[PDB]
From a paper:
The [name] RH protein, termed [name] (235 kDa in mass), has been shown to be a potential virulence factor that allows the parasite to invade a wider range of host erythrocytes. In erythrocyte binding assays (EBA) it has been demonstrated that [name] of [name] binds strongly to erythrocytes in the presence of ATP, whereby weak interactions have been found in the presence of ADP or the absence of nucleotides. In this context a 94 kDa domain of [name] of [name], which is highly conserved amongst the RBLs and called the nucleotide-binding domain ([name]), has been found to selectively bind ATP and ADP. Based on these traits and the absence of significant ATPase activity of [name], this domain was suggested to serve as an ATP/ADP sensor during the invasion process.
The second domain, NBD94566–663, covering the amino acids close to the nucleotide binding segment NBD94444–547, has been crystallized by vapor diffusion using 2-methyl-2,4 pentanediol as a precipitant in a form suitable for X-ray diffraction analysis. Peak wavelength (0.97898 Å) data was used for the SAD technique in which 12 out of 18 Se sites (6 SeMet in each molecule) could be identified by SHELXD that were further refined by SHELXE. The electron density map for the main chain atoms is excellent showing the typical sausage like features for the helical regions, whereas for the side chain atoms no visible densities could be identified. The structure of the NBD94566–663 molecule consists of two helices that are linked by a loop, which is not visible in the electron density map. The length of the long and short helix is 97.8 Å and 48.6 Å, which are formed by 65 and 30 residues, respectively. Due to the kinks from residues Tyr60-Lys62 and Ser85-Glu87 both helices spread apart by an angle of 40.2°, thereby forming a hinge-like feature. The longer helix of chain C in the asymmetric unit is highly distorted when compared to the other molecules. By contrast no nucleotide-binding could be observed in the constructs NBD94566–663 and NBD94674–793. In the crystallographic structure, the residues Gly61 and Ser85 of the N- and C-terminal helix, respectively, are in a very close proximity of 9.8 Å and the very N- and C-terminal amino acids of NBD94566–663 spread apart by an angle of 40.2°. This structural feature of NBD94566–663 enables this protein to move either like a hinge or like a rattle up and down, thereby transmitting ATP-ADP modulation in NBD94444–547 with up- and down movements in NBD94566–663, which have to be coupled to the α-helical and chair-like NBD94674–793 fragment of the C-terminal region of [name], representing an elongated protein with three subdomains of 96 Å, 35 Å and 20 Å in length.
Numbering used by the authors: 7 to 72, 76 to 107
């Protein structure tokens, strides 16, 4: 204990300098969620692109490209009439919240 005061130093270099590792040991699991974050974000933003061309852009272009009108009817118009799913989502939210 006298010279073996270097045992409290060992005690320190132990637990104290051991729990030093169990910090960066969570810094990895962090750099996983952090990693996953953008890793999906961008991947999807890529399939949010294909829409803008195939929708909005290909819309105006096709809505200039021109029975045939019947297709133009069931087109963008019934494509908006799809969004009845929001009402098929609203009252549901307004359900499990009373």
């Amino acid at each position: 204990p006298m010279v073996k005061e270097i045992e409290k130093k060992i005690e320190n270099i132990v637990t104290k300098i051991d729990k030093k590792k169990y910090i960066y040991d969570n810094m990895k699991k962090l750099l996983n969620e952090i990693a996953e974050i953008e890793k999906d974000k961008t991947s999807l933003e890529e399939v949010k692109n294909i829409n803008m061309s195939y929708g909005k852009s290909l819309n105006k272009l096709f809505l200039e490209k021109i029975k045939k009108k019947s297709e133009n009817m069931i087109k963008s118009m019934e494509k908006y009439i799809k969004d009845l799913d929001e009402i098929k989502e609203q009252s549901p939210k307004a359900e499990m919240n009373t």
